[PDB]
Amino acid sequence: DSWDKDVYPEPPRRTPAPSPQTSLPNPITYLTKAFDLLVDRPVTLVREFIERQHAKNKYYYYHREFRRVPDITECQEKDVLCMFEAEMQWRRDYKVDQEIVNIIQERLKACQQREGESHRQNCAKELEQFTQVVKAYQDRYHDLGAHYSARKCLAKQKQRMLAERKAAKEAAAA
Amino acid sequence: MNLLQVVRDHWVHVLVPMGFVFGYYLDRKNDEKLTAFRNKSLLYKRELKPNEEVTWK
Amino acid sequence: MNMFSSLSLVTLLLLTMPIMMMSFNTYKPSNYPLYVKTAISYAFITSMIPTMMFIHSGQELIISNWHWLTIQTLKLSLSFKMDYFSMMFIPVALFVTWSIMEFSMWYMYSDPNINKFFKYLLLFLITMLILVTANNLFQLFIGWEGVGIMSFLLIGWWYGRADANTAALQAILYNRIGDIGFILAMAWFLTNLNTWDLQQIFMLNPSDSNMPLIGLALAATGKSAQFGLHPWLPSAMEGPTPVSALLHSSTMVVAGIFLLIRFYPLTENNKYIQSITLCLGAITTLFTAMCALTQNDIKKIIAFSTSSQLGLMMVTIGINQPYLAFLHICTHAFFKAMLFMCSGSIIHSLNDEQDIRKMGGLFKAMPFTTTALIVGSLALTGMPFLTGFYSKDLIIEAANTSYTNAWALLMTLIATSFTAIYSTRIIFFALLGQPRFPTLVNINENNPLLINSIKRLLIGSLFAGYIISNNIPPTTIPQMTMPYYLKTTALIVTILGFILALEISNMTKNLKYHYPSNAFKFSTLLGYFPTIMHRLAPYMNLSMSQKSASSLLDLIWLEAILPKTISLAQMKASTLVTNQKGLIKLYFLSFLITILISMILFNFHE
Amino acid sequence: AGGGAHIEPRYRQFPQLT
Amino acid sequence: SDAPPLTLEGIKDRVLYVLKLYDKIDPEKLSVNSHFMKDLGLDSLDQVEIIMAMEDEFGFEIPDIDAEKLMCPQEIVDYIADKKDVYE
Amino acid sequence: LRWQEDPEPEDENLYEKNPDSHGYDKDPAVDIWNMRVVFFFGFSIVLVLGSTFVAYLPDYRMQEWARREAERLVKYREAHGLPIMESNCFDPSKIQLPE
Amino acid sequence: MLKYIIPTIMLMPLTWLSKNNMIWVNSTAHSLLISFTSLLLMNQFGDNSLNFSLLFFSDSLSTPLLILTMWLLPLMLMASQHHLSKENLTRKKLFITMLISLQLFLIMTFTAMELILFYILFEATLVPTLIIITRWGNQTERLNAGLYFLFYTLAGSLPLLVALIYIQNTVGSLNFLMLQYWVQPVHNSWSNVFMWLACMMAFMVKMPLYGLHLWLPKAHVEAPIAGSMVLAAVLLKLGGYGMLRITLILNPMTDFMAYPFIMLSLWGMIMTSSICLRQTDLKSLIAYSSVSHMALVIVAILIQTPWSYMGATALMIAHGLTSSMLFCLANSNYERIHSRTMILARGLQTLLPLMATWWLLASLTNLALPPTINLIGELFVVMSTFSWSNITIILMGVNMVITALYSLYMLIMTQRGKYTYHINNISPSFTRENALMSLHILPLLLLTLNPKIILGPLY
Ligand SMILES: CCCCCCCCCCCCCCCCCC(=O)OC[C@H](COP(=O)([O-])OCC(O)COP(=O)([O-])OC[C@@H](COC(=O)CCCCCCCCCCCCCCCCC)OC(=O)CCCCCCCCCCCCCCCCC)OC(=O)CCCCCCCCCCCCCCCCC
Ligand SMILES: [Zn+2]
Known part of the structure; x- marks a missing residue:
C-alpha cells in the first residue's frame, strides 16, 4: 500500500502481551490513552478533512519508460548519432544501478537495527546479498574516473574477459 | 504630470524586459532549424496523433 | 511506537523554538531569560516519557525523517538515534542545564547582554543534542563542530x-x-x-580497525582534553562561571568520551586500541590530578578535577567497560555542575575574588553553599551511596580484576588518592579557618534563584546514581567476587587521602618558614607544558610564516626566478638593439656582413 | 543580584543571616 | 554588582579607620592633612605599609609609580574616589 | 609645492544632511528608492521566489526516477530468481576479443 | 542563451539613457531581474545537457557558475556607490559599462560549446578586468598590478591557442560534444608532454597554481571593491572550469603528469595558509586565503574521481560567495579609516554591533564550519584524496588547523579588544552595507538545504 513489500521486506511482528505482576499503576498505560485523545484523534480529523478535498480533484502522474536501443558495442567508430544514443542509455542505466545499491544498503541497515543484539546471526542473508550486488557493481563501474563513458566500461569488460579467459587456459592445463 | 516627463524619464524600463522577450523569441527560431531528427530518434519515435502534426515545436 | 517517536523529536524541536521566536522578534524582551528556562523545564519532562518507555520495555528506534543528499551510492539523511545512550543522557543534560540557567538568571543579572548570553547557552544545548542523537558521522560532525564554536563564543564572552x-x-x-x-x-x-x-558499520564489523579507531581516539583526545591536548580546558575558565558549569564541566568535555562509547562494537574486538585508550587516560587522570594539588584559583581546581574525571572515563573505555564509562558521565554531570555553582556563589559574595587564599570562615556565613559544597565533595571523592559511588567504585573494581597494564592500574589508584586532597584543599581553604576576605563584603546568598537552582542538583547529587543504577537494563557480567583488599581499595585509598590531606593543611598554620621545591613548582606550573609549548610552538610556526613562507619565497625567490629575470633580460636586450649612434658608415657595414654571412655560413644563395 | 530578601551589609562583623 | 556604592564620606571614614588601628600614629592628632612624613615622623618604609593596608581594605592594587606620591590621608581619599568613579 | 594641486579633500558624512540616510545617495528621494529596489527585487523576488522555484524543481536530474525505476528492477529480478545485478555491463554475445 | 545575452547588452543603453541621478537604481534593479531569470537554467537532465544551438550549451557545471555570475553584478553595483560618489558622470557610467561588458563575456564563456569560442571569450575578460584595476584603483601600484595580471595570463594563454588549433587539425572539431565521442588516448611521448603542459598551464595560472600566483596578491589587493569581488569570485573559476573541460582529452597522460602539480598544490596549501598568519594588510590576508582554497580545487580536478569532481564544483561556488563577502566586509572598514592595515582599527564590535555579526558568519563559513557548503565541498575533496593516498590526510588536516587560525585571527584582531582611541569617524553601518552582506550570506546558507544543485555533472 504505502510502499511495495517485495522490494522492502518487513518481517512479521511478535509483541509480548502485558502481564503485570505488581500493583502500582503503569504511567505508560495511562499516557497512551491520554496521548490518543489529545494527539492521535485531533491529528486524524484534520487529515480526514484534507483527505476529502483530494478525492474531489483526483489526477494522475506517470512513471517514464525508456525503450531499449542499440548499446555501444553495436555502433561503428566515430558515429556520433549511434554513439550518442548508445551513450545516454548507458548513463540512465548507471543511475539505476546506483539506486539498486542504495536499496540493498537500506535492507542491511534496517535489519541490523531491527534485530538489536541478534544482528550478528539473523542478518546473514542481507549481509550475503549486500556482498554480491556490490561485487557486480564494483566490477562494472569502479575505476572509470570522472569522465566515465560507455566506451570505457566496455574497454574494461573486454579487459576482464581476457583475464577470465587466460585463467581458463592455465586452469584447463592439468 | 500626465503622459509627459513620466514617459520621457521612464521609457528605459522596457529595454531589458524587451530584451528578454526579443532574446526569448530568437531561441524558438533557432530550434526550428535543428528539427532534422524530430520524431526521428530511436528513443522517442512514434505515430502522430489524429490532430497532432509535429512532436514538438 | 507512534508516541515514542513524537515525544522524542518534540524535545529537540522545543529547544529550538526560542531561537526561531528570536529571529522575527515575536516575543516580549526582559522576560527572555525566564522564557528559555521554561522551555528547558518543559523539554525535560517530555524527554522522561521516552526514557520511561525505554526503562520499561527496552524500546529503541531510529528516525530518518528527511532525505538530504545522495552522493551516488551514499545516501545522507537527517537521522536520529533513540537508544540506551541517547535516552539516558538527554534527561540529565536538560536537568543540569535547567539548574544552570536558573543560576545564571541570578549570577548574570547585571550583564547588559544577558539576553544574548542565554541564546548562546541554548544554541550549545541544541548542538550537544545533535551530537548525542546523531546516527551518522556527517550528522555527528555537525554537532561536534558546533559545540566547539559555541565554546569559542562563550569563552570569549568578555x-x-x-x-x-x-x-x-x-x-x-x-x-x-x-x-x-x-x-x-x-x-x-x-x-x-x-x-x-553507524548501522552499516557495525553490521560489517571491520577487522582491521586500527586506523579508523586511532582517528576516533585522536578526536576523543582533543575534545575530552586528555594528555597532549589537555591545556585548553584549564584555560577555558576565562568565561563566565555559568558557561564553565554547563560546557566545560559536564556536557561538552564528555563528548570526546561519548564518541568512543558509541563505537564500542568495534573497540571490543580491538585490544590494541583498548591498550592505547587505557594508557592515554591513565596518564591524564594522574597528571591532571597532580596539577590540582597546588592550584589557588577556585575554578581552576575544579577545572583540573574535571580533567582527572575525564581521564578515568577513558581508562574505563580502555579496560573494555563502555557502559560504566557512560554511567560515570551521567553521575558526574550532577555533582560536578554543583561545585561550579557553589564556587560561583562564593565568588560573587566576595566581589569577584577567585583566590582561595583570600577566602575563609565561610562555613558559618554561607550555610547553604557550605552544605551544597560539602555534599558535592563527598560525591566526587566517592562517599558510599552518593551519586559518585555507584559509578566510580564500580570502575575501580573493574580495573583491579582485569587483564590491565600494571602501570596504568597504579596511576588510577594513585590519582584516586589525589582526588581527596584537592577536594579537601577547597574545603579547608574556603570554609574553615578565619576570614581572609576584605573588611567590607556583602556575603548574601538568599536569592531564591540561587537556592532553588542548587537545591535541585543537591537532590540529584544524592540519589541520581542510586536510581539510575537500579533501573538501567543489564548489559555485562559484573565482577562481584574478588579479594577483600581489592574490593575496598578506593575506600582505603580515599580515606588515606583525607588523612594525608588533613595533616598537610595543619602544618601550614605553624610558624615555620617555607622552602620552595622542584615538586611544588612543577605542579604549580602545570608541569611546564603550557609555559614551554605555548611559547615554543607559536614562536617556531609564526616565525616561519614570515621569514621563510612570506619573505624568502613569495617576496624574493618566486619573484626572482620568473617575473624579474625575464623582465630584466628584455630591458638589457632593449638597450643593445637601440644603442645606435646613427652613423651611415656603420649601418651599411652591417648590411655587408649580413650578405656575406647569408652565403658562407648559411648558403642562402643555393 | 536581584530579587529575594534584602540583607544590609556589615563592617568587620559576621554577616547578617536569615 | 549588588554591592553598596561608595561615598566620599565612606572613603574618608574607612581610610582614617585603618590609620586609627596603626600603633605608630596618635589618633588624637590624626587629621586629613596630617602629612605622613613631616607631620608624623613616619619613615617611607612605614608609608609603604600604610598604602598596603589600604589596598587590602578596598581590595584593589595601587601602582608604585603613584602610591609613593601619596603623602596625605586626603590624597588617598581623592585618589580612590578618582579611580573608583565617585562624585558625591 | 612643485605644482598647483588642490588639498586632500575631506570625506563627507552622509548622515549630517540626512540623518535618515540609507547610505546610497545624497538625494533623500532617490536614496529611498534605491533601498526599495534592492530590498524588493533582492530579497522579496530572488531569494524567496527563487528558493520556492528551486524547492519544486521537476525531478532535478531524474534521481527520483532512478529510485522509482530501481525498485521495479529489484521487484522483477528477485521474483524470477535472476541475479539482482549482473556483473557484465554489456552482453558478450556481441563482443569479440582480440584473440 | 540569447534570453540572457541580449538582456545583458540592453543594460548598456539603460545606463546611458537613464537620468543623471538614477544610473544606480536602474542598473541595480534591472540587473537583479536578469539574475532572477537565470534560474531557468536549472532544467538539467540525468543523462544529457542543455544543448541550445550550435554555439552555446549549458550543463550542471556551467549552470551554477552562470547563476553566481549574474548574481554578483547587482552586488558589485551596490559596493561601488560609495567611492564613485565624487566622480564625473560619464566616468561613473563607463565603470558600469565595464562591469556590464565583463558579465557579458562571462555568461558566454561558461556556455560556449566550441573550445576556440571558449578561448576568445575566456581571453576577452582581460580587457574590462584590466581597465577596472588600473583606472579605478586607489594606489600607485595598480599600474604595476595590471601588468603582472595581464602578462601572467597571456604568457600561459598563448601556448593554449596553439594546442587547440593543433587538436582541431588532427581531430576535425573542437565542439565539446564531438570531443566526448572522438576523444582518443594520449600516448606517453615528448610531443604530448608539451601538449598536456600547453593545455593546462593557461588555466593553472588563473586558478592560481602555487608558484605562479604572484599576480593575485597584486591584482586583488589593488583593484577596487567591484573588481576584487569579480576577480576573486568568478574569474578564478574560469581556470577551474577550464581544467574540468580540457581534462577530457588528456587521458591517460593526466595520471602521471599531475605529480608536479598536485605536490605543488598540496604543499602550497600550508605555505599560503601560513602566510595569512603574518599579514599586516587586511585585504591581502583575504587574497592569500583565495590561493589556499583554490589549491584544493586543483588537486581535486587532477585526481579525477566523481567525489573530487562533485567536491571541486562545490568549492568553486562556496568560495565565490565567501571570498566576495570577505572583501565587502574588509572594504566597509576601509571606507571609514581609509587604510588597509589590519591592526589600525580594533574593537569594532563595541562600535558596530551588527557589522560584527557578519564577520562572525563570514569567518565561520571561511573555515568550513559544517553543514555550510564550504565544508561539503571541502569534505568531498578530502574523502577522494584519501582514496588517492592515505598520507594526504596529514596535509589536508594540517591545512584545516591553520585555516581555523587565520580566519578567527582576522575576526579577533579587528572585532575584539579595546577600540583605537584616536579613531572617531566610525559612523554606524549604512543600510546599503548591511543589505550587501545579507545578500552574500543568505544565499550561501540557503544552499545547505538543497546542495545537489551545486554538485556538478557527476551528481
Ligand atoms: C516559502 C515561504 C517562506 C519564505 C522562504 C524565503 C526564504 C528566504 C530566507 C529567509 C530566512 C530568514 C532570514 C533572516 C530574517 C531576518 C531575521 C532577523 O530579523 O534577525 C534579527 C536577529 C535578532 O535581532 P538582534 O538581537 O538585534 O540581533 C543582532 C545581533 O547582532 C545578533 O548577534 P548574535 O550573536 O546574538 O546572533 C548572530 C547569529 C547567531 O550567532 C551565532 O550563534 C554564531 C554561531 C551560530 C552557528 C553555531 C551552530 C552551528 C551548527 C548549526 C547546526 C544547524 C544544522 C543542524 C542539522 C542537523 C539537525 C537538524 O544569528 C543567527 O544566526 C541566529 C540563529 C543561529 C543558528 C540557529 C540554528 C539552530 C536553530 C534550530 C534549527 C532547526 C530549526 C527547525 C525548525 C523546523 C523545520 C521547519 O538578529 C539576527 O539574527 C541578525 C543576523 C541574521 C542572520 C540570518 C542568517 C541565519 C543563519 C543561521 C546561522 C548560520 C548557521 C550555519 C549553518 C547553516 C544551516 C542552514
Ligand atoms: Zn570612503
Missing part, C-alpha cells in the same frame, strides 16, 4: 579581555587537531565500508 580571546582561540586550536582524527575516521569508513551510518 571580548575586551585580551586573555579571553587567547583562551577562546586556544580551545579552537586544540579541538581542530582532534578533528583531524575525526576526518580520518570518516575517510576510512567511506573507502573501506562505503557508509557513514
Whole structure:
C-alpha cells in the first residue's frame, strides 16, 4: 500500500502481551490513552478533512519508460548519432544501478537495527546479498574516473574477459 | 504630470524586459532549424496523433 | 511506537523554538531569560516519557525523517538515534542545564547582554543534542563542530579581555587537531565500508580497525582534553562561571568520551586500541590530578578535577567497560555542575575574588553553599551511596580484576588518592579557618534563584546514581567476587587521602618558614607544558610564516626566478638593439656582413 | 543580584543571616 | 554588582579607620592633612605599609609609580574616589 | 609645492544632511528608492521566489526516477530468481576479443 | 542563451539613457531581474545537457557558475556607490559599462560549446578586468598590478591557442560534444608532454597554481571593491572550469603528469595558509586565503574521481560567495579609516554591533564550519584524496588547523579588544552595507538545504 513489500521486506511482528505482576499503576498505560485523545484523534480529523478535498480533484502522474536501443558495442567508430544514443542509455542505466545499491544498503541497515543484539546471526542473508550486488557493481563501474563513458566500461569488460579467459587456459592445463 | 516627463524619464524600463522577450523569441527560431531528427530518434519515435502534426515545436 | 517517536523529536524541536521566536522578534524582551528556562523545564519532562518507555520495555528506534543528499551510492539523511545512550543522557543534560540557567538568571543579572548570553547557552544545548542523537558521522560532525564554536563564543564572552580571546582561540586550536582524527575516521569508513551510518558499520564489523579507531581516539583526545591536548580546558575558565558549569564541566568535555562509547562494537574486538585508550587516560587522570594539588584559583581546581574525571572515563573505555564509562558521565554531570555553582556563589559574595587564599570562615556565613559544597565533595571523592559511588567504585573494581597494564592500574589508584586532597584543599581553604576576605563584603546568598537552582542538583547529587543504577537494563557480567583488599581499595585509598590531606593543611598554620621545591613548582606550573609549548610552538610556526613562507619565497625567490629575470633580460636586450649612434658608415657595414654571412655560413644563395 | 530578601551589609562583623 | 556604592564620606571614614588601628600614629592628632612624613615622623618604609593596608581594605592594587606620591590621608581619599568613579 | 594641486579633500558624512540616510545617495528621494529596489527585487523576488522555484524543481536530474525505476528492477529480478545485478555491463554475445 | 545575452547588452543603453541621478537604481534593479531569470537554467537532465544551438550549451557545471555570475553584478553595483560618489558622470557610467561588458563575456564563456569560442571569450575578460584595476584603483601600484595580471595570463594563454588549433587539425572539431565521442588516448611521448603542459598551464595560472600566483596578491589587493569581488569570485573559476573541460582529452597522460602539480598544490596549501598568519594588510590576508582554497580545487580536478569532481564544483561556488563577502566586509572598514592595515582599527564590535555579526558568519563559513557548503565541498575533496593516498590526510588536516587560525585571527584582531582611541569617524553601518552582506550570506546558507544543485555533472 504505502510502499511495495517485495522490494522492502518487513518481517512479521511478535509483541509480548502485558502481564503485570505488581500493583502500582503503569504511567505508560495511562499516557497512551491520554496521548490518543489529545494527539492521535485531533491529528486524524484534520487529515480526514484534507483527505476529502483530494478525492474531489483526483489526477494522475506517470512513471517514464525508456525503450531499449542499440548499446555501444553495436555502433561503428566515430558515429556520433549511434554513439550518442548508445551513450545516454548507458548513463540512465548507471543511475539505476546506483539506486539498486542504495536499496540493498537500506535492507542491511534496517535489519541490523531491527534485530538489536541478534544482528550478528539473523542478518546473514542481507549481509550475503549486500556482498554480491556490490561485487557486480564494483566490477562494472569502479575505476572509470570522472569522465566515465560507455566506451570505457566496455574497454574494461573486454579487459576482464581476457583475464577470465587466460585463467581458463592455465586452469584447463592439468 | 500626465503622459509627459513620466514617459520621457521612464521609457528605459522596457529595454531589458524587451530584451528578454526579443532574446526569448530568437531561441524558438533557432530550434526550428535543428528539427532534422524530430520524431526521428530511436528513443522517442512514434505515430502522430489524429490532430497532432509535429512532436514538438 | 507512534508516541515514542513524537515525544522524542518534540524535545529537540522545543529547544529550538526560542531561537526561531528570536529571529522575527515575536516575543516580549526582559522576560527572555525566564522564557528559555521554561522551555528547558518543559523539554525535560517530555524527554522522561521516552526514557520511561525505554526503562520499561527496552524500546529503541531510529528516525530518518528527511532525505538530504545522495552522493551516488551514499545516501545522507537527517537521522536520529533513540537508544540506551541517547535516552539516558538527554534527561540529565536538560536537568543540569535547567539548574544552570536558573543560576545564571541570578549570577548574570547585571550583564547588559544577558539576553544574548542565554541564546548562546541554548544554541550549545541544541548542538550537544545533535551530537548525542546523531546516527551518522556527517550528522555527528555537525554537532561536534558546533559545540566547539559555541565554546569559542562563550569563552570569549568578555571580548575586551585580551586573555579571553587567547583562551577562546586556544580551545579552537586544540579541538581542530582532534578533528583531524575525526576526518580520518570518516575517510576510512567511506573507502573501506562505503557508509557513514553507524548501522552499516557495525553490521560489517571491520577487522582491521586500527586506523579508523586511532582517528576516533585522536578526536576523543582533543575534545575530552586528555594528555597532549589537555591545556585548553584549564584555560577555558576565562568565561563566565555559568558557561564553565554547563560546557566545560559536564556536557561538552564528555563528548570526546561519548564518541568512543558509541563505537564500542568495534573497540571490543580491538585490544590494541583498548591498550592505547587505557594508557592515554591513565596518564591524564594522574597528571591532571597532580596539577590540582597546588592550584589557588577556585575554578581552576575544579577545572583540573574535571580533567582527572575525564581521564578515568577513558581508562574505563580502555579496560573494555563502555557502559560504566557512560554511567560515570551521567553521575558526574550532577555533582560536578554543583561545585561550579557553589564556587560561583562564593565568588560573587566576595566581589569577584577567585583566590582561595583570600577566602575563609565561610562555613558559618554561607550555610547553604557550605552544605551544597560539602555534599558535592563527598560525591566526587566517592562517599558510599552518593551519586559518585555507584559509578566510580564500580570502575575501580573493574580495573583491579582485569587483564590491565600494571602501570596504568597504579596511576588510577594513585590519582584516586589525589582526588581527596584537592577536594579537601577547597574545603579547608574556603570554609574553615578565619576570614581572609576584605573588611567590607556583602556575603548574601538568599536569592531564591540561587537556592532553588542548587537545591535541585543537591537532590540529584544524592540519589541520581542510586536510581539510575537500579533501573538501567543489564548489559555485562559484573565482577562481584574478588579479594577483600581489592574490593575496598578506593575506600582505603580515599580515606588515606583525607588523612594525608588533613595533616598537610595543619602544618601550614605553624610558624615555620617555607622552602620552595622542584615538586611544588612543577605542579604549580602545570608541569611546564603550557609555559614551554605555548611559547615554543607559536614562536617556531609564526616565525616561519614570515621569514621563510612570506619573505624568502613569495617576496624574493618566486619573484626572482620568473617575473624579474625575464623582465630584466628584455630591458638589457632593449638597450643593445637601440644603442645606435646613427652613423651611415656603420649601418651599411652591417648590411655587408649580413650578405656575406647569408652565403658562407648559411648558403642562402643555393 | 536581584530579587529575594534584602540583607544590609556589615563592617568587620559576621554577616547578617536569615 | 549588588554591592553598596561608595561615598566620599565612606572613603574618608574607612581610610582614617585603618590609620586609627596603626600603633605608630596618635589618633588624637590624626587629621586629613596630617602629612605622613613631616607631620608624623613616619619613615617611607612605614608609608609603604600604610598604602598596603589600604589596598587590602578596598581590595584593589595601587601602582608604585603613584602610591609613593601619596603623602596625605586626603590624597588617598581623592585618589580612590578618582579611580573608583565617585562624585558625591 | 612643485605644482598647483588642490588639498586632500575631506570625506563627507552622509548622515549630517540626512540623518535618515540609507547610505546610497545624497538625494533623500532617490536614496529611498534605491533601498526599495534592492530590498524588493533582492530579497522579496530572488531569494524567496527563487528558493520556492528551486524547492519544486521537476525531478532535478531524474534521481527520483532512478529510485522509482530501481525498485521495479529489484521487484522483477528477485521474483524470477535472476541475479539482482549482473556483473557484465554489456552482453558478450556481441563482443569479440582480440584473440 | 540569447534570453540572457541580449538582456545583458540592453543594460548598456539603460545606463546611458537613464537620468543623471538614477544610473544606480536602474542598473541595480534591472540587473537583479536578469539574475532572477537565470534560474531557468536549472532544467538539467540525468543523462544529457542543455544543448541550445550550435554555439552555446549549458550543463550542471556551467549552470551554477552562470547563476553566481549574474548574481554578483547587482552586488558589485551596490559596493561601488560609495567611492564613485565624487566622480564625473560619464566616468561613473563607463565603470558600469565595464562591469556590464565583463558579465557579458562571462555568461558566454561558461556556455560556449566550441573550445576556440571558449578561448576568445575566456581571453576577452582581460580587457574590462584590466581597465577596472588600473583606472579605478586607489594606489600607485595598480599600474604595476595590471601588468603582472595581464602578462601572467597571456604568457600561459598563448601556448593554449596553439594546442587547440593543433587538436582541431588532427581531430576535425573542437565542439565539446564531438570531443566526448572522438576523444582518443594520449600516448606517453615528448610531443604530448608539451601538449598536456600547453593545455593546462593557461588555466593553472588563473586558478592560481602555487608558484605562479604572484599576480593575485597584486591584482586583488589593488583593484577596487567591484573588481576584487569579480576577480576573486568568478574569474578564478574560469581556470577551474577550464581544467574540468580540457581534462577530457588528456587521458591517460593526466595520471602521471599531475605529480608536479598536485605536490605543488598540496604543499602550497600550508605555505599560503601560513602566510595569512603574518599579514599586516587586511585585504591581502583575504587574497592569500583565495590561493589556499583554490589549491584544493586543483588537486581535486587532477585526481579525477566523481567525489573530487562533485567536491571541486562545490568549492568553486562556496568560495565565490565567501571570498566576495570577505572583501565587502574588509572594504566597509576601509571606507571609514581609509587604510588597509589590519591592526589600525580594533574593537569594532563595541562600535558596530551588527557589522560584527557578519564577520562572525563570514569567518565561520571561511573555515568550513559544517553543514555550510564550504565544508561539503571541502569534505568531498578530502574523502577522494584519501582514496588517492592515505598520507594526504596529514596535509589536508594540517591545512584545516591553520585555516581555523587565520580566519578567527582576522575576526579577533579587528572585532575584539579595546577600540583605537584616536579613531572617531566610525559612523554606524549604512543600510546599503548591511543589505550587501545579507545578500552574500543568505544565499550561501540557503544552499545547505538543497546542495545537489551545486554538485556538478557527476551528481
Ligand atoms: C516559502 C515561504 C517562506 C519564505 C522562504 C524565503 C526564504 C528566504 C530566507 C529567509 C530566512 C530568514 C532570514 C533572516 C530574517 C531576518 C531575521 C532577523 O530579523 O534577525 C534579527 C536577529 C535578532 O535581532 P538582534 O538581537 O538585534 O540581533 C543582532 C545581533 O547582532 C545578533 O548577534 P548574535 O550573536 O546574538 O546572533 C548572530 C547569529 C547567531 O550567532 C551565532 O550563534 C554564531 C554561531 C551560530 C552557528 C553555531 C551552530 C552551528 C551548527 C548549526 C547546526 C544547524 C544544522 C543542524 C542539522 C542537523 C539537525 C537538524 O544569528 C543567527 O544566526 C541566529 C540563529 C543561529 C543558528 C540557529 C540554528 C539552530 C536553530 C534550530 C534549527 C532547526 C530549526 C527547525 C525548525 C523546523 C523545520 C521547519 O538578529 C539576527 O539574527 C541578525 C543576523 C541574521 C542572520 C540570518 C542568517 C541565519 C543563519 C543561521 C546561522 C548560520 C548557521 C550555519 C549553518 C547553516 C544551516 C542552514
Ligand atoms: Zn570612503
